[PDB]
Amino acid sequence: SCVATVDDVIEQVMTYITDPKDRDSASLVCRRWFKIDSETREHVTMALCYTATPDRLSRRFPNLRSLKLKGKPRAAMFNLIPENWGGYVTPWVTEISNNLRQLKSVHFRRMIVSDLDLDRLAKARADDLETLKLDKCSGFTTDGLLSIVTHCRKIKTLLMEESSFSEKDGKWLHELAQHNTSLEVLNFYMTEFAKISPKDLETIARNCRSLVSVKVGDFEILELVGFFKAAANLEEFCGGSLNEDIGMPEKYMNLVFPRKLCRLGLSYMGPNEMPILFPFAAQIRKLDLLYALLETEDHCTLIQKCPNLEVLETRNVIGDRGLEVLAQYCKQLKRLRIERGADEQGMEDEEGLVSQRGLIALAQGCQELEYMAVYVSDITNESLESIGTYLKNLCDFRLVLLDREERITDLPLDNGVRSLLIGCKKLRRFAFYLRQGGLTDLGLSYIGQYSPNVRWMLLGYVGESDEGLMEFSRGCPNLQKLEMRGCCFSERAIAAAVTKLPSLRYLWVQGYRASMTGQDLMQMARPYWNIELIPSRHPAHILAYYSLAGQRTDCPTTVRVLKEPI
Amino acid sequence: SCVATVDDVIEQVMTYITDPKDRDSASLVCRRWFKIDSETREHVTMALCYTATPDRLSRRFPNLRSLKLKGKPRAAMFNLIPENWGGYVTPWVTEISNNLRQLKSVHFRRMIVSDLDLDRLAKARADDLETLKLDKCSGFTTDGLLSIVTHCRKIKTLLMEESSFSEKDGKWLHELAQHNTSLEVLNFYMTEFAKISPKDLETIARNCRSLVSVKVGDFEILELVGFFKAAANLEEFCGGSLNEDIGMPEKYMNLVFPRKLCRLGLSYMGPNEMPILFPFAAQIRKLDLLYALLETEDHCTLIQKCPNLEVLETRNVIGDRGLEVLAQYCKQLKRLRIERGADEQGMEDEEGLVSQRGLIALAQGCQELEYMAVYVSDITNESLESIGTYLKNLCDFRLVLLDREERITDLPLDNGVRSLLIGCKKLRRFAFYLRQGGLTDLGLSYIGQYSPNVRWMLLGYVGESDEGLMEFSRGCPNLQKLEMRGCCFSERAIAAAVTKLPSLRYLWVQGYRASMTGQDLMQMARPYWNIELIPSRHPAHILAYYSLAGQRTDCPTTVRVLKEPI
Amino acid sequence: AAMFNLIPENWGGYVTPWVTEISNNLRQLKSVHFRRMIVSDLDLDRLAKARADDLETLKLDKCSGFTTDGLLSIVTHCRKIKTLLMEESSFSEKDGKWLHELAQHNTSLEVLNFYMTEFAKISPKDLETIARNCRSLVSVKVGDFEILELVGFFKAAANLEEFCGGSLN
Amino acid sequence: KIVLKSSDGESFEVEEAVALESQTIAHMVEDDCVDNGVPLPNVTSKILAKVIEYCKRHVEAAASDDDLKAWDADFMKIDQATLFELILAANYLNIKNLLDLTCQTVADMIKGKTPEEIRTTFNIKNDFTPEEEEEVRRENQWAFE
Amino acid sequence: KIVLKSSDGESFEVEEAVALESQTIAHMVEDDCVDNGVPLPNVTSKILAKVIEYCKRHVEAAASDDDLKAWDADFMKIDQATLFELILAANYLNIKNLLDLTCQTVADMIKGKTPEEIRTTFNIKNDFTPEEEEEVRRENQWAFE
Amino acid sequence: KIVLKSSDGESFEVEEAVALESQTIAHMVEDDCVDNGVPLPNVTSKILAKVIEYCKRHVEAAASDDDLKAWDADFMKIDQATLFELILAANYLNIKNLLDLTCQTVADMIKGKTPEEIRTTFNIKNDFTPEEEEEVRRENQWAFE
Amino acid sequence: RRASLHRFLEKRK
Amino acid sequence: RRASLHRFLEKRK
Numbered sequence A, B: 001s002c003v004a005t006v007d008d009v010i011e012q013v014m015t016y017i018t019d020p021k022d023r024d025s026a027s028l029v030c031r032r033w034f035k036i037d038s039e040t041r042e043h044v045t046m047a048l049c050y051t052a053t054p055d056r057l058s059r060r061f062p063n064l065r066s067l068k069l070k071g072k073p074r075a076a077m078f079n080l081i082p083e084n085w086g087g088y089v090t091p092w093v094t095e096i097s098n099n100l101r102q103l104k105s106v107h108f109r110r111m112i113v114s115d116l117d118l119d120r121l122a123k124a125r126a127d128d129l130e131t132l133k134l135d136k137c138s139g140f141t142t143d144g145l146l147s148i149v150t151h152c153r154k155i156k157t158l159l160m161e162e163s164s165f166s167e168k169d170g171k172w173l174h175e176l177a178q179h180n181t182s183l184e185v186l187n188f189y190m191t192e193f194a195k196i197s198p199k200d201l202e203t204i205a206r207n208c209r210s211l212v213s214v215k216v217g218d219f220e221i222l223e224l225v226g227f228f229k230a231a232a233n234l235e236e237f238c239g240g241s242l243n244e245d246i247g248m249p250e251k252y253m254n255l256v257f258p259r260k261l262c263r264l265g266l267s268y269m270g271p272n273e274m275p276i277l278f279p280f281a282a283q284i285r286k287l288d289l290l291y292a293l294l295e296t297e298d299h300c301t302l303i304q305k306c307p308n309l310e311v312l313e314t315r316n317v318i319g320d321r322g323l324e325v326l327a328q329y330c331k332q333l334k335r336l337r338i339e340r341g342a343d344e345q346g347m348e349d350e351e352g353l354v355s356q357r358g359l360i361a362l363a364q365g366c367q368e369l370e371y372m373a374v375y376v377s378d379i380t381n382e383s384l385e386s387i388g389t390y391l392k393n394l395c396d397f398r399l400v401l402l403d404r405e406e407r408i409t410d411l412p413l414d415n416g417v418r419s420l421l422i423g424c425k426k427l428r429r430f431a432f433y434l435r436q437g438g439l440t441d442l443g444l445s446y447i448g449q450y451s452p453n454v455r456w457m458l459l460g461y462v463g464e465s466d467e468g469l470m471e472f473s474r475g476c477p478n479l480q481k482l483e484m485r486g487c488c489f490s491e492r493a494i495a496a497a498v499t500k501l502p503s504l505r506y507l508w509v510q511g512y513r514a515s516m517t518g519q520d521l522m523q524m525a526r527p528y529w530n531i532e533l534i535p536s537r538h539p540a541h542i543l544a545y546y547s548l549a550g551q552r553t554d555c556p557t558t559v560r561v562l563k564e565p566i
Numbered sequence C: 001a002a003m004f005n006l007i008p009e010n011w012g013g014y015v016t017p018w019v020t021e022i023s024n025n026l027r028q029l030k031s032v033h034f035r036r037m038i039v040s041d042l043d044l045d046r047l048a049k050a051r052a053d054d055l056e057t058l059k060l061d062k063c064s065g066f067t068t069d070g071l072l073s074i075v076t077h078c079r080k081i082k083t084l085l086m087e088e089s090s091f092s093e094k095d096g097k098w099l100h101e102l103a104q105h106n107t108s109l110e111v112l113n114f115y116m117t118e119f120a121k122i123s124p125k126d127l128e129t130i131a132r133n134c135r136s137l138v139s140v141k142v143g144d145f146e147i148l149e150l151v152g153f154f155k156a157a158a159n160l161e162e163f164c165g166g167s168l169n
Numbered sequence D, E, F: 001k002i003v004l005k006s007s008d009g010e011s012f013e014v015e016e017a018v019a020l021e022s023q024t025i026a027h028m029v030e031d032d033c034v035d036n037g038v039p040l041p042n043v044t045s046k047i048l049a050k051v052i053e054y055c056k057r058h059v060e061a062a063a064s065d066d067d068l069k070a071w072d073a074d075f076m077k078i079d080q081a082t083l084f085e086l087i088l089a090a091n092y093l094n095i096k097n098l099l100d101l102t103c104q105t106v107a108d109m110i111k112g113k114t115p116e117e118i119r120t121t122f123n124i125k126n127d128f129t130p131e132e133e134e135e136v137r138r139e140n141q142w143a144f145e
Numbered sequence G, H: 001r002r003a004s005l006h007r008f009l010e011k012r013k
C-alpha cells in the first residue's frame, strides 16, 4: 500500500466520461490514457468517410459498439452531387467483418450501400446487430434487406428513411413478421414500397412488445387499423396515406390511435380528417405536417389545440397567421422547421408566406426555441434583431429568403445579423441564404466577428466582393465546415480565406469567379488537404477536406482531383 | 372510449396463464386467443417426437423458449427396445436452427443425438443456450460436448445423466473450467468418464458462484476435497466414489462438506464412511442410497438421523425394518422409491425384503407421501387397503412384486387394489406389476372402474382372460398412455380395448396371444393411428400412438409398420 | 482381428483428428481411404465442407459410427466425386436421400460401392438414373436389390465392367 | 403535489409519490410538462379516479402485507368493462403493480374452465371453422404439452 | 447487526441494511462467512469508515432527495488520494451508488478541461513523442468523433 | 512480547527473540507496525503455530546440537501438503534455518527415486513427447554428468 | 429544392 | 433389469 495515484483508478473512471469532446482531451493527456480511451470508446462518428482508412479506425478503436459514417456532401440532398460521386460503404463493412468484432449498431448516412455489402454485414454481425440505419443511402435492393432481417434475428432498430433501392419483393417485411420479436423502431418513412403487405406490419406490432416508433410509406391508413390496435406501446407514427373520397364523408373518424401516441404526422391529411387528432391533441409533443394537405387556416386551428407541442415541422403554408398562433399557445416549442412549399402557382394560398411579422411574433412567444429553420418570403433587420433579443439558447438557426418576391422590405441585413449573432451566443450551426443585395462586405465581416461558437455555416448570396470573404475569414475561431453557394468571390479569395481559418476542415463551394488556369485554388495546397472539383457540367463545385488517407481511389470521371502543376 | 372488452386486454393477461392445461383451453376459445397463445407460449413438451413434424411445432409455437422431446418408449430403459429404434434428434435441431430463434433451453429424453447434431445446435444457438439436457440419450461423443461448451459460453445447466457416448478426451470439462462462469447445475451422474480431471471440476467450483447442484461419475471423493471447499453454494451432490482401504481406518472422516448440502448421495458409501453424514443429517432433505454399500441395519441408523427427509431413493435392502424406522422419524416424507437389489444370492441380507409389514408401517407413518414406488417381495390385500386409507394425495404409485418368493401370503389382490384406487383419488400415475395368479378379471375391471384421474398405467401380470381386458376397457376415462407386459390377452382383445378407451394416445404391449395372420390388430385401424411391431427376435412388441405426421420414415429393419392388407 | 469380432467396438480408430488436420493443413487432398476406423457424422460433414469439389474419392472401408446424414453431407458438398465406397461399413440408415442426391446432380461417378451393406431405404430408380448420367461409370457393387428391379440400370450402364451384389430371388 | 388532467377536462390534485407509481408520469417530470399539469387524455375521469385510489393505498405500505391482498381483492369487485378499462389504464400509465393483480384476476377467471365455459363467461363467439378447431384439438392432445 | 473486519484488524459494528448496500458483502451472507465477521482486508480502516458513513446516510432515504445532493457534494470535499481510494473501495465492495459516485466525481474533474489542464491537476507527465501527439490530435479533429 | 496476527484473525502471544527468527518480522520493528500487532495474512493459523513451535525450540540453543537433529527429524514427520506450506511460510517470513529444513525434507523425498517413482509419489503427469524424453535421457547418459 | 419535398410537391399535384 | 443398476450390480461385484 503506497499513495494511490489517478493511474490506479483511471481504467475505471474513463468509462464515466461520456462526452465525445472530453474523451478527445483525455486521449491526449498521456500514452496510458490514450490506450485506455482507445480500448473503451464505444461510439465514433466520422463526418466524412474519406477522412481516414478503415484500418486506421479499427486500429484506434478496436472495441467500437456503435459506428456512424457519412459520405456524400450535404449538397447531395438537393440533387447537386453526381450519383456516382462516392461514399462506398464496402471497405467499411469488410473492416467491420474482420476487426470491429464488437459492433452492434451501424448508421450509414448518404452512402452507397450494395446488396453484397449488406449480405456481408448481415453474416458478419448476425445476432449482434441491434441497430441498422440506412439513412439517405442508395445502391441496394430488397435482397439486401432480406439478408439482414434473416441473419440478424435480434434487430431492435431498422431504418431506411429516404433511401433509394430497387424493390423486387416484400419478403423482407414478411420475414420480420414471422420471426422478429425485438423490434423497437422501424422506419421506412420516405420510401416507395409497393409490394409490402400491411398485414405483415400488423403482425409485427402484435409480436413486438417494445415497438415504440414506426414510420411508413403510402399505406392506406384504413388498412392499418389492426396495426394501431396491436401497437399498444406505440409513441411515434409517421406516414400512411389519408385518401378521402366524397363517397364516405366519415371515411375515418373511427380510428383507434394507440394511447401514448404523442409524436406523429399523417401524410396527405386534409381539413376533413384533421379532427381525428383532437381527442388527444393535448398529448402531442411532435407534429410533422410536412406532407399535409391543409391550408393556413387549418394550421392555426390544429396548432391551437397542441399546448405541449415541442417540435413542429411544416411547409410555409403555416403563414404569418400560423406563427402568431404558435406564438402563444405553444410556449414550450423547442424546434421549428418551415420547409418551402409549392412555389409555382401562388404560395398555396394568399397567407402562405411567412415574413417579419411571423418571425418577430415567434421570437416573442416561443422563447425556449433551440432549433429554428425557416424559408421566409420577406425579412427585415428588425426581425433578426428580435430573434437575437428574445430566444437565447438557440443552437441552430437557418434562414433562406425565397426568390419569389420582387421587393424585400429593407435589404442590406448587416445590422440584423449582427444583433442576432450577439444575442444567440449558444449558436453552433448557422445558415444564411439570401439574394445578391442581401448582405454587404461589412455584414459578412459581422458574421465572422460575432460567431465564436459556430462549427458549421451555410452562406447564401452574401457579400459584395472579395473584401467581404477576407474580412469574414479573420473570424470564425471554431468554424469547421463551411458551405457557400451563389457567391461572387474569386478563386484566390477562397484559397486565401481557407488559409486564414484556424479550424476549417471541410469546404463546399458552388459559384465563384473561376479560371481555366485552375492554378489559383492551388494557393491553398497544404499537406493532407484534398481538393476536388466537380466541373461545370450546374456551376463548378469545389470540395475540400483534410484527410489522413491521401486522395480517394474511387473518383468518378465527373470529378477531377486537383494536384500540383499539371 | 367505448366499453372495454376482454379483447382489449387478452394479449396482456395470456402471459399470466402458466398451466399447460389452461393454455390448452385458452388456445381453443377463438381464432384470436389461438394466435396470442401461439405467439406467447414459452414451454412445450412432446411426449413422443414422432407425433408431429418439426415444421408443425415451429408453425404453432414460433417463439418457444424451452423445448422437451422424448423419443424411445419407456421400455428402452430396460433393454427391451432395439438401439436403432428411432428418436433421432436431428430434424429437430435443424428446425431449431432455422425457426425456433428464441430457444434458450433444450431437453432431449431417450433420443439419438449425434456429434453433428450437437455441433449444429451449439453454433445455431450459441450464447443463447442457457440449458442443455441429454437425458438417457446415445449416439454422440466428447467432440459434441466440446462443441457446445465452446460455442455456448453462458450455459447455466448442462446435463448428461445416464447417457451413452464415446469418451475420446477430457477437454470439454477443461473448456468449462477455463471460461465458464454461469454454471448453476452440472450433471453427469450415471456416466463412465475416465479421462476428465477432478482439478477441472474444482476450478469450475471456484469460478461459478451460482453453482448449486453437481452430480458426478466415479471420482475418488478424496480428490474432490478442494472442489467441496470451493463450492460454497452447493446444495446438491451425488456420485463420487468412496473407496475404503483397511490401511487408512479413518480415510475420510475429514471431509469438508459445503454448509448447505442438503440433497445428496455418495456412491459406494459403506457403514464405516456413513458417519461423515451425521454432523448435518438434520439438514438432509433428499437421500440417494441407490448405489450405497450399506446393510439393512445401517439404513435404520442413518434414516433415524434424518427427521427432515422428504425424498428417499434406495434398494430393497432398506428392509421392512428400515421402513419401520422411516415410518416415525421422517413424517415429512414426500417421495420414496425402493429399487430392486442384487436378487441372485440371497436378498443382500436376511432382512432385505420389504413386505406387507413395511408397507402398512409406511402407510401409517408417512401420510404426506405423494410418490411411492416399490419392488416388494410379498403383498397382502391388507397393505393395499392401508395405503388407500392413510396416504391420500398420493399422485404416483408403483408396485412390482418380485418373482423370488414361491408362496405369496394371499394372492388374488382384487379387494386391495379396489380400496387403494378408492382412497388415493389424487392418483395420476399407476403401475401394478404382478405374477399370473395376481389379479382376476374382476380386479382388472376394478382398476378401470376406480381410476378416473389416471393418465398413465403400466400393468404387470394382471387378469385371467380377455374378459378382464374388455371390462377394464370400459373405464379409465382419462387413460392416455397404457403399458402392459406379460399379459395373456389376444390380438382382437387388445384391438377392441383400444377402440373403447376414450383417451388413449399411446400403447406399448409385450406378450400377447399373437397370430402370424397379423390381421387381428387391424381391427383398431383408425386414421392417424400408427401401429408398429417389434417382432419376436423377447416376445413381439406392439407400439401404437396417434400422430399428425404419418408413418415414420426412419424405421430399422427390426421394426415392421403395420398397414392394411399385405 | 476386428474383422472377426475379436476387438471391442470402442477400441479406437477415431478418424476425427485426422479430418481436422486435413481441413487445416492437407489442402491438396483429393482422395481419402479410411480402413477399419470410427467415422462420425460430424467428421464427415467437416471433411465434405473442407474438401468439397476437390474430393474425387472417399472410401469408408469397414468403418463404423456414422449415418446417412454423413453420406448426404458428402454427396451434396462433393459434387465431383469419382469414387465413393462403403463396403462392409456399419452406419445408421435414416433415409435414402444420399442416393437420390447423387442421382440428381452427380455426373462424374466412376465407381460406387456399397457391396456388403444393409440399405433398405434407397431406391433402385435412383441407381438407374445415376447410370444414365454417369458416362464413366465402370464399377458398381450393391446390397440386396432385386436383380429384376435393376433391368433399367443394366441397360443404362453401357460402360459397366464390374457388378457385384443384388439379390436373385 | 402534481396535477393530472383527465380525458374530459378534470384536474386531479395528487401527491408526489402517488403520481410517481406511474412510470409514464415519472418519465414526464424530466421534460417536465408539469407546468400545465400532466396531460393524459386517454384515461376516463371515472377510471383515473380509481387508478389514483389504488396508488394512494399501495404507497401507504410505508407503514409496512396481509391487509393488502384484502383491499386488493375488494378493489377488484368491479364489472368487466371496468376491469378492462383499468388494464388499458395501467398499461397507458405504467403501473406494474396495477397489473400483476388485475391481470392475475382475469387469468383466475380462465383457470380451470373449458373452452366453452371461457367464451360463455366473457361472451365470445367461437369463430373457428370445424377443421381448424379439430387441428388445434389434435395438436393439443396428441402432440404438444 | 454485522461485523466488518478492516485491513488492519479493526472490527466495525454496522447495521443490517447498511452492510447490504455492498453486493460484495450481501453475496457473502449466502455462504455466510459472517460467523467470524466479513473479512475484507483490502479496505483501509480509515476508508471503510468513510464508506459506512456514506451507506448509513443513503439508507436513511427511508424517510424519503434535495438534501442528499447536498450531503453528497459535501462528502466529496476530500483530497485526491482519498477520492481514489473510495473508488477502489466502492468497486471492491459493490456499491453502485458510491462507485457511480466516486468515479463520477473524478470524471467531473476531467470534464471540460484541456489536456494540459488535466495533467496539471493530476500531476501527469506528458510522455508523447511529438509525432504521436500530432497523429492523435489529427485523428481526433479531422477524422473521428 | 510481540503479537502475530494470523491469516484468519488469530492473535499469537510470542516472546521477543522467538518472533525475531523471522527477518521479515524483525525488519518490521523498524517502522514498527507492532502497534497493532504484526499483520501477516499469508500464513494459515495452523501453520503459523507450527512455525512458532520450531522457532521456540531453536532459540533454546541458549543452553547450548545432538538432540536438535532429533527434534528436527521428528518435527518433519508431517504430510506433504503441510511440508510445502511450511516452505512457503519460511520464505514468507524469513527463517533461513527453517527453509533449509523443509526444502531439504522435500529433497530427501526425491533423492534415490527414479523418474517414475518421483511423479508417482507427488502425482505428476509425465508430459514429455517420447522424442523429448529420449533426447533428455541420451544427454543425461551419454554426454553430461 | 430539398429532394424529399420535390417528390411530394409533385405527388401532390 | 433397469440399465442404471445393471451397470452397478456388476461394478459392485
Ligand SMILES: CC[C@@H]1C[C@@H]2C(=O)CC[C@@H]2[C@@H](C(=O)N[C@@]2(C(=O)O)C[C@@H]2CC)C1
Residues within 6 Å of the ligand: A074, A075, A078, A080, A373, A374, A375, A398, A399, A400, A431, A433, A458, A483, A485, G001, G002
Ligand atoms: C448546396 C447547399 C444547399 C442549397 C439549397 C438551396 O437551394 C436553398 C437551401 C438548400 C440548402 C439547405 O440546407 N437549406 C436549409 C435546410 O435546413 O434545408 C437550411 C435551410 C432551411 C431553413 C443547402
Ligand SMILES: CC[C@@H]1C[C@@H]2C(=O)CC[C@@H]2[C@@H](C(=O)N[C@@]2(C(=O)O)C[C@@H]2CC)C1
Residues within 6 Å of the ligand: B074, B075, B078, B338, B373, B374, B375, B398, B399, B400, B431, B433, B458, B483, B485, H001
Ligand atoms: C415396459 C415395462 C418395463 C418392464 C420392467 C420389469 O422387468 C418390471 C418393471 C420394469 C418396468 C417399470 O416401469 N418398473 C418400475 C419402475 O418405475 O421402474 C415401475 C416399477 C418400479 C417399482 C418397465
